[PDB]
Amino acid sequence: NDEERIRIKEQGILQQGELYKQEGKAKELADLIKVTRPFLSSISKAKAAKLVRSLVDMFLDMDAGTGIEVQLCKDCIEWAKQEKRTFLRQSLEARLIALYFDTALYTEALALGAQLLRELKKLDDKNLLVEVQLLESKTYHALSNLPKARAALTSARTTANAIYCPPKVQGALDLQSGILHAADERDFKTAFSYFYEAFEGFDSVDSVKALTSLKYMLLCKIMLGQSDDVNQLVSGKLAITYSGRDIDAMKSVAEASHKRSLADFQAALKEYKKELAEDVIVQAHLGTLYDTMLEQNLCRIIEPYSRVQVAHVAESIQLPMPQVEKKLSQMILDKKFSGILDQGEGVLIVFEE
C-alpha cells in the first residue's frame, strides 16, 4: 500500500503539472516545482530526476518569458547542488544551455557549456556529452564562428562514434554536418549527403526534422545548379508523403531556376516568405541564390544575340540600366561571361563561346 501510494503521487504530480501547462498557469507550476521537493527524497535519485526534468520541460513550453524560464532553471540547478543530486544538476544545466541557445542568449550558452564540458569529459556514459558538444557547435555557428563550430561538431561525432546513438541524436548530428558543409557555400555536394542521411534517420521517428532535412536536400540541389533533380527527389515514394508549403516553396524556386527567371524567383520568395526567408538556413543562402538568378536570367536574354543593347537587356529583366551594366561588367571581369562592353554606345558584344 505504500510503494503504491508513492506511485499514485508521481502520476498526480505530473497530471497536475501538465494541467497547469495546458491552462497557461506558470506561477502555479513554479510553486508545484518547489512544493514537491521534500517528496522527491522518498524516491530514488533517478525517479526524482525524471520527475524534476519532466516538470521543468513542462515549464519551458509555456512562453513564460525567457527571464522567468532562465531563473527557474538556475533555481532547480542551485537546489540540485544544495542536495548533491549530481546527474540531475548536470542534465538541468544541459537543458539550460538548450534554453540559452533557443533564446539567442549565446555567450551564456558558451559560458555554461564550458563549465559542464569539463565535468562531462571526466565521466562514463557519454550520451550527455554528445548533446552538449552539439549545442556548442550550434551556438558557435550562430555566433558566425565556423572553425569552432566545426571543431565542436567533430568532437560530438567522435564521441558518438563510440556509443550507439538513438536516431534523433544521429539525425541531429547529420543535420549539423549538412548545415556546416553548406554554411560557407563550398561543399553543397557533401552537405546534400548529410542531409540525405538526416532525412533517412528522422523519417518515421521525427517528421518535423525529417521535413527539414528533405527541404535542405532540395536547397543543396538548387545551389549546385542541379535543380532538375528536385522533381525526381520529390516524386520518390517516400518524399511524396511530405507534401506542403515547405516542399512547394523549394519546387517553386526550382522552377524559377529552370526557367532562368528572376521575376519568378521573386514571386516565390514573397509567396513563401515563411518557408524561405524565415528559415535561418535557407536565408543564409538567398543572397548568393539571388546573384545566380540574376545572372542566369541575363544569360537567357543575351543568348539570341552576338550584339545587344544594354538598354534592351535592362528593359527585358525590368531593372535599371546602371545596375545591369554594372552586373555585366562584373560577370565579364570574373570570367562568368565571355563578352565585352562598349560603354559609351551602350552595347554588349558576345563572343562565340
Where does the chain have alpha helices with state H?
Answer: 2-22, 26-35, 45-59, 66-82, 86-102, 106-120, 127-142, 146-162, 167-183, 188-202, 207-223, 230-235, 237-240, 245-258, 262-271, 280-302, 310-317, 321-333
**Pairing of the two strands 307-309 and 347-350:** antiparallel
What do you get for the CA distance between the two ends of the chain, in Å? 89
Enter the C-alpha cell of residue 46: 533517478
Residue with cell 539567442: 104
CB atoms within 10 A of CB 270: 9
| Burial status of residue 317 (CB atoms within 10 A of its CB: 0-12, 13-18, 19 or more) | middle
Residues 277, 265: Cα–Cα separation, whole Å: 12
309 — phi, psi (to 5°)? -70, 135
Cα angle, residue 297 at apex, residues 295 and 299 outer, rounded to 5°: 70
Place of cell 541564390: 289
C-alpha cell at 235: 516524386
Distance CA 340, CA 353 (A): 13
Distances in whole angstroms, Cα of residue 136 to Cα of each of 97, 112, 131, 324: 9, 10, 9, 43
Instruction: Report how far residue 289's alpha carbon sits from residue 275's, in angstroms, rounded to the nearest whole number.
Output: 15
Task: Classify residue 182 by its DSSP letter.
Answer: H
Contacts of 309 (CB under 8 A, 6+ apart): 346, 347, 348
Q: Cα Rg for the chain, rounded, in angstroms? A: 27
Rounded Cα distance, 274 and 168, in Å? 25
Elucidated via: X-ray
Distances 217 to 228, 257, 258 between C-alpha atoms, Å: 13, 16, 17
Whether 217 and 195 have beta carbons less than 8 Å apart is answered as yes
CATH topology classification for 1-353: 1.25.40
Q: How far is CA 190 from CA 90, 104, 170, 195, in A?
A: 35, 28, 17, 9
Q: Is 316 helix (H, G, I), strand (E, B) or coil?
A: helix
Ranges of each domain in the chain: 1-353
Q: Please check whether residue 22 is in contact with residue 64, taking contact to mean a CB–CB distance below 8 angstroms.
A: no
Residues 82, 104 contacting (CB under 8 angstroms): no
CB 56 within 8 A of CB 68: no
**d(Cα 19, Cα 129) in Å, to the nearest integer?**
33
Q: Residue 342 forms beta bridges with which residues?
A: 347
Beta pairing partners, 345 = none
DSSP string, 290-302: HHHHHHHHHHHHH
Q: Tally the residues of the chain.
A: 353
CB 194 within 8 A of CB 178: yes
CA triple 132-143-106, angle to 5 deg: 55
Sequence-distant (6+) residues with CB within 8 A of 319 are: none
CA distances from 290 to 65, 163, 196, 263, 264 (A): 37, 42, 25, 11, 11
Cα–Cα distance measured from residue 309 to residue 312, given in angstroms and rounded to the nearest whole number:
5
Non-local (6+) Cβ contacts of 78 within 8 A are none
CA dihedral 82, 87, 89, 90 (to 10 degrees): 140
SS3 48: helix
